[PDB]
Amino acid sequence: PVLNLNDPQAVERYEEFMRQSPYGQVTQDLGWAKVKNNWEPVDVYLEDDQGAIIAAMSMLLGDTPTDKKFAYASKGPVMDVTDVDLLDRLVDEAVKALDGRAYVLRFDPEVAYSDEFNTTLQDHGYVTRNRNVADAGMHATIQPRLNMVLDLTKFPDAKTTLDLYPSKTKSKIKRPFRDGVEVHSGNSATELDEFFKTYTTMAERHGITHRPIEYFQRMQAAFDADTMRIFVAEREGKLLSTGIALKYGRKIWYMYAGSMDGNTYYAPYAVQSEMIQWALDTNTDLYDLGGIESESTDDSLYVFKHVFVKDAPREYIGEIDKVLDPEVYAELVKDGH
Amino acid sequence: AXCXX
DNA sequence: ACCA
Residues that bind substrate, according to the entry (chain A)? Predict the structure, then answer.
């Protein structure tokens, strides 16, 4: 069925499924539509024989230079996507709800790439975007397909962040604290202002693009302090570094960050240590540091994140496209050939 | 445009 | 150096 966003009882039942599923993702929460307020939300779900939700997909519809919309279910759907017969049923419900308005429904779930899964999806009629587009870089897909994820279940007895690391890394993490860096955290306008200062400073330093403050304000309005937390590192009253982490489903996800110009005393490592500590304190399975471009010392994202993730990066299946208007799909999407 | 999110 |  399609979710009626104006029925609070239905919305709460959908949210309860999303928040309690092991496949839950913050980008599939209905609060994500409030963040992405320039996109149109369309949400669908399936029920078991007793009427309980068993699978859900939160879609956001965006504009294109054509008459068609782009339908996108970020890190969805919320279910076991390797159960492809059930995936087909949910995708069929989503297609009914789109009512021919979109040229594609794209979803990019956090499931490992494998040849067997890629082949099954193609056998079921989907177009996949992964290793065939890898040569285009990190931004070949909307979200990074290679991600540095710390599996904390490998350390069931860890009490503090340092318990996860070899001595050489313990030293790297201890250094900012020894040098007077202190970290606080919260989800108020005060911490958001501190974040935004460091985030805009980082973006200007790298010549890259950056989101307006209202984006993060909508996120702070949508998610409470048990879900969204801004960590702020200072040394003797000087603001040094920040980061935003979101706790949802089985992971705490380091999403945005920045540092001020000048000497920062390794403050980003202190931010990471506290974000990891939040994961340990809440018994969360995964700490996700997010995307890299390649598993190489030439990639500075990998170098930094490899300090905290010694295992191999997780490589996901990438973008799964249910093609709805093939003429528009061919005009707007390249297949990597 | 750039890390997603 | 970057430490997103």
Answer: 36-39, 103, 211, 215, 256
